[PDB]
Symmetry: D3
Subunit: 297 residues, 6 copies
């Protein structure tokens, strides 16, 4: 029923299309791309592809599957048209500001926006909140990898001279990580300059980063990723409460599925902007509540 | 700030008291017990203890730490007084109905009730809900133990002729569980009788149960418990997404802590009755939302 | 490049197509299906689809992605046309016999056939052989699941009255397995008779099998599967040598990828029929040998 | 049976003898040592021990259990006498070159040579090849230890001044390793110079190496070793395929057992030089093929 | 039966009190504190609390739950009074000397002293001793954490300017540890100064230490800790024997419990001073030996 | 220095010989066998083998490596000659009686005896005692396997008609085990009768046992074994204390090494009989105590 459009046909966008088609409560009106070539990708045969969302039926919701750094602008554009929006904006240091920014825009145009709705930020944030209130005193650790960071990869591919890139995240334990970036340079690019731009990027300035040039990125790339979140803390006055959550998943696949759920929820909220911990988890499930209560609680 | 009362001073009740005292946004007005002897238990020295909640300040919320089967009547009594209530009612097949029964009573008295707010039902429910929407197709398994089930223990304890009892839950894998009950009989009691009663209790009727008489239950009892929840499912059209969540904790201590977070949440809801998946996870955290968003998302 | 055709567009066939397309030394000529409807599934847009392999260019090799019980007939058909063939025939009981049956047919038509080339039988077989000669004395245990057995699922779907079916394999440990079948019955079929047919099928008669009728098989089905192969044996006269191999993979995806490698190898062999342990592992890698030796040995 | 001689009665040689004695298809003709003292070690009682392979019956195959840096010369010597040879040459850097060097010598004398046939290089190489074709895209990580590297230990023992030495390999993760060397110095030798020689030896120059002088190497030495080989890759176009192989074994025991199997295979090959991935796995099993197919595939 | 006194009411002291009360063969005569305020802590309601052990019954044994560096003087004082003593003195390099110093003082006053009786030193020592004689050759590694070190915390706490502190121990593997100190400073204190003092404390001088100032230590502190002890060694002439021991426990609670068992043991020894490996493990069990032999051996 | 004899040259006995030769504080005077053939086993060349201990020098201690059921009689024989004795008598239900039986015999002849000194009973008993006093309330689980039980194997080999046997122990979790016995029958034996005798044996009457006839036991036999002992209990009043100990070892190898340590200890005790929990663990280590204190505590 909910009419949706996938914006940005990249990694997450391609899985988003599949997530929307499998969804029992949604309808894929079309796909919004920067350009639409005469050669139609196999999986888009029979799918409406356009350069502007307005040329797409009566779109009520949009999955913003574009680069994180482009999320703010797209989000505002869709919101100003009264279209609910979901994105997986992953900059932890700024998403709280983005929410305050989109809130009024969303409210004034009678729509809802759910930002940072991937697995991290996203579902892992809900997990961190659970662990936070289950054992208030202590420390939580979120260890990523080994795997591909779609966000870091996009930032490297954005560097001039980079034909293609793979940003891998390696867990060093205790919340600390190391990053290995493999770059496929364009003919004429200067490795040293590309290395400088990578390490200077805010995405990379806080972690030990190692850049290596390679002949082929696709030969080394696997979009799989994972996480291990752990907490050793106190329940009331009771110490040594141990919690552990782990995933070994297809990064883009899970992100897109989560984004779909967040949009299902966005369409149920009062106009405004939300992060995933501000929405009752039942709003992420399709259909009436009763059945989910009996099945899950 | 929030004035609270712990109702029922047993296992969970003891930890509930500690959980409330450690919470930054709550004040423990007192403890409600069926009886108050002249001999004051040490941890209660300096704590108001009465047989009726009416003799306690201006109690705004109450943690119902009484037997599961006694929860319905207690919740209705506190609600009819305008007191928010939280309980850890653990009968999965019935809780949905309990929610529908308490909803109107809660609403008509301007109060909010959060039922089944322990770790399972409770937080494990929120977890199951996440796994469900992160990968809509497939199967989720919840394996408990090895550990003590406070609920099953209470049930056995109530049986006539049982001086004390320990109900252990053993994980057989794939969601199947074996139950081992260690019962300490009262002088001159019919074992075969107690045994028969145990096996046919709705709490035991569905699982493979073994009963063994022992000289001392306290010599064998440890209130530790744990869980392993797993899901192998499909995100969109992408198969083999793997998720795993595990806990190894003091059972009653976690439950009491979760109940505390839930009551905090209850005081923030519109009058009515809710299960934990019907509340935004951030309302379980004390204080303003903004800081929690920067820290967790 | 090796001109290749995919026979049977089911689960394995779907991934097989993707496997061939990604292969650097192969060209996908077309797909052979029992029938070709006017409605072209998206992924087959631009792909030649016929009902007889002879209407496909100059096919040199064929991937028999048909039901295991149909493999012998397809293989002979293909072999009699000078086309190398590969299948994932999974009946351990008599695959050795199939090999003896196809050997002369393959030799007399100047073609090679590599049978039972999935992950088990297939790659797991090579692993069992290594374990076997690395520690000649002791016992090997191959534990499957939890996951979907594509072969058992196909067998159940073939029973009259079954609309759709899922056969999951559960590891009981020590090489023992339990099978849980979920069936979506056809309007009118009798559960009891379908259940009897499933339990007595040669695929299930040797394992504790449980059958359950469900409303939706697709809601529970995930094609992921896995294995844990272990061996505690003797090297020479030195006891307690410990080996362990494990996989958590997309079942049909891996099967098809292996079939492509097996076909690559098939084209390099003398005319005849082989199992995977009768072929040097290097023949499964594309291109000249030298590079793989330096990279892998 | 295949008449076999063990060349080099060191660690590997000792287990090699036991491996041959347990082999159903082999006969131990004798052992070749640099010298034969009048004091016969217990285990060699009844075993013919000479200084030149020609004084051994009619030896058809030889296990070169000599230092890796001595292998090329021994292999050629043996091959020039029409004797099939097997070694565990472990220098990954140029074993491919050794193979090209021995190929003609082996072919021109009608004998077969299987080089680098230990567990790594050796069996682990076959495993890396399988992983390679099961999931063509992604990266493989081979993590060693904690344990004793027989090869690095031999190199250290060869340095002037070293009375005895132990070189342990420590897994740092992601294919990275740290090496901890324990040396028992000869009366008078200088630690600083021995330390320098160790650290700059080609065996150690590529890894973070630490050297420590000890009073007794035998007190710390255990020949056990292990490995964890992992791969997260793509099958066809399906990402996140997870594979893991692990062993906890007696290093030299396994090495010698594999060498025996490699020699068994060597005798079945056309004259020439091979690595283990160039030989069908079934040639490593004793006796007719049929039985192994039924038992393993 | 055995009349006991808990000396020092801090972390371990609190649990020591609980440990003594639960022990079947002991009576808690009282608690010795440097000061006794009019405000009686709830758990001490009904417990005799004094500033000198002479004001407590006929104390026969004392648990010295005071800072490690204060243990020597306290032990000598209790011993000179004929009181058996147990402590958890954790300085590994010094304890042997402490044993030689307390031995005569203990003997000349007809008392027994068991030093360093926590879990490490203490029970972990007994464990290391077993692994040592079960496999005499090889190496044992003791990896602590993640968790809080009561000892290191006390040390930091004592530093001038530190209001409160949390010393966490992180396992780097192979016996190496990283230390993370979280310090809550007193108003107007020099961080760089406190930081400098910490890093040079004998407790910290040998390991990689990081110091971080925080607003609240209690918000981060959890007294849980753990350990993983492993040994790969030789039993006789048989290599690769693998042993592994792990604990995940409430640090101060286990220590207090072990100290209780040790004191029980102390009252059973000939006058003098002992470490835990110098006492038959059965003297740590209450009551007659016969039953323990039937139950444990 | 301590002069020792190995009695019974079977599995444990052969490793016992090696354990004694590696021991720094012992001397192997000889081996006592029921018979001594003209053909000397390789490893006994240079070792004195006789049919009666009296023909062995000045034997001060003896390792009784004979069947458990023969231990009582041998133990008494050696003790009556003033020879310390060690055995690995594994019948848990009776060893407590055996101790009371040997005690007076040992004392009257001025010797010491350490019974049930293997790994279980033996070192695992010491482990169980530690866990018992570290957390008094709770339950301990000892899970064996998969592996070979030397004791059960001996009992089956003792059955008339059994040419050779392998008794494997499989862990079913929670202290429960299953037993798989593989028997190689003599020509003429009756499988049914052998099966009856196996299942009737006290060694097998308390566990689910399955007997299978096979052509070769040596083809399936691996003397490796292991254990996982776990405890979830209370330290004082603190619940959920988690402990876990695991071993993957050469069964006979470890048993013999432990027996050697027990004898080293036996020679340090006052005349009498002991189980391993009645001896300070330091007495199991060679040489002066001081060094072990500084190294282990
Ligand atoms: N858990 C999380 O929160 C989480 C997880 C995974 C991913 N993510 C986020 O997902 C974002 C996208 O990932 P991806 O791998 O799909 O990236 P991608 O493959 O580059 O796809 C982005 C698509 O947006 C469009 N696009 C590219 N550059 C653009 C630009 N500069 N301006 C406007 N549109 C542009 C393109 O689609 P068209 O060519 O069709 O226009 C492009 O294919 C990442 O930045 C990452 O931060 C977050
Ligand atoms: N490791 C292993 O060795 C291993 C692993 C996985 C799978 N396998 C084998 O793979 C086989 C196929 O699995 P799958 O999941 O791909 O089955 P599937 O999804 O049912 O597809 C089989 C295809 O075979 C073609 N076909 C030809 N004759 C058929 C017939 N008589 N009945 C039904 N279909 C027929 C059909 O394609 P068209 O409609 O296009 O004609 C059908 O879609 C299984 O039987 C299993 O034994 C082996
Ligand atoms: N996976 C693998 O591929 C793998 C694994 C394990 C070991 N290896 C290889 O095995 C090789 C041997 O290991 P090891 O532990 O058996 O060494 P070792 O204990 O030192 O024995 C080597 C034997 O070689 C003979 N020898 C002939 N020439 C020699 C020389 N020039 N210097 C010293 N000895 C000489 C000696 O026997 P005589 O005294 O009887 O002449 C010596 O005992 C290592 O170099 C290692 O690279 C490979
Ligand atoms: N496995 C082990 O061996 C192991 C494990 C855990 C802990 N420990 C040891 O336990 C020791 C104590 O730990 P904790 O956490 O209980 O420390 P704590 O919380 O500071 O308690 C020590 C108590 O001793 C008294 N005290 C403090 N400073 C003193 C001083 N300067 N002189 C005399 N008395 C003093 C105080 O009790 P009053 O106020 O009542 O006088 C204080 O509460 C640590 O030093 C650690 O080394 C050893
Ligand atoms: N943790 C433990 O407590 C533990 C662990 C492992 C083993 N064990 C015990 O070790 C015992 C022996 O194990 P094993 O594998 O060495 O058995 P084994 O291989 O049969 O060796 C026993 C030896 O004693 C002699 N012997 C055999 N039968 C005898 C008889 N009926 N009367 C007198 N002597 C006899 C023989 O030596 P000769 O031919 O040289 O006379 C025989 O080789 C087992 O019963 C088991 O209970 C205990
Ligand atoms: N921050 C983690 C997880 C990022 C997940 C998602 N934001 C992505 O871009 O892959 C990383 O560095 O891998
Ligand atoms: N009771 C356990 C361990 C026995 C260890 C030792 N007593 C043996 O005979 O192997 C079993 O059934 O395997």
């Amino acid at each position: 029923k909910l009419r949706v459009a996938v914006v940005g046909y990249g990694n997450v966008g391609r899985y988003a299309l599949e997530a929307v088609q499998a969804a029992p409560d949604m309808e894929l009106v079309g796909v919004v791309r920067r350009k639409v070539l005469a050669a139609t990708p196999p999986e888009l045969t029979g799918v409406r592809v356009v350069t502007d969302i307005s040329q797409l039926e009566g779109v009520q919701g949009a999955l913003l599957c574009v680069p994180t750094r482009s999320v703010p602008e797209y989000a505002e554009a869709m919101l100003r048209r009264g279209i609910h929006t979901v994105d997986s904006y992953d900059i932890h240091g700024d998403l709280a500001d983005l929410r305050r920014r989109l809130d009024p825009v969303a409210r004034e145009h009678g729509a809802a926006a759910v930002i940072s709705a991937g697995w991290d930020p996203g579902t892992d944030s809900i997990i961190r909140a659970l662990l936070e209130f289950m054992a208030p005193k202590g420390i939580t650790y979120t260890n990523f990898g080994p795997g591909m960071s779609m966000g870091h990869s996009v930032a490297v591919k954005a560097i001039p001279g980079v034909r293609d890139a793979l940003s891998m995240t390696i867990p060093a334990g205790m919340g600390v990580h190391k990053r290995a970036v493999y770059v496929e340079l364009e003919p004429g690019a200067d490795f040293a300059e590309v290395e400088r731009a990578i390490k200077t990027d805010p995405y990379f300035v806080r972690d030990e980063t190692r850049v290596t040039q390679v002949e082929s990125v696709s030969a080394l790339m696997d979009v799989g990723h994972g996480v291990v979140m752990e907490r050793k803390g106190v329940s009331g006055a009771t110490h040594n409460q141990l919690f552990r959550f782990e995933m070994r998943i297809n990064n883009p696949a899970l992100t897109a599925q989560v984004m779909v759920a967040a949009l299902r929820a966005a369409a149920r909220q009062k106009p405004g902007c939300y992060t995933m911990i501000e929405i009752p988890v039942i709003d992420y499930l399709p259909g009436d509540r009763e059945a989910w209560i009996r099945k899950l609680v």
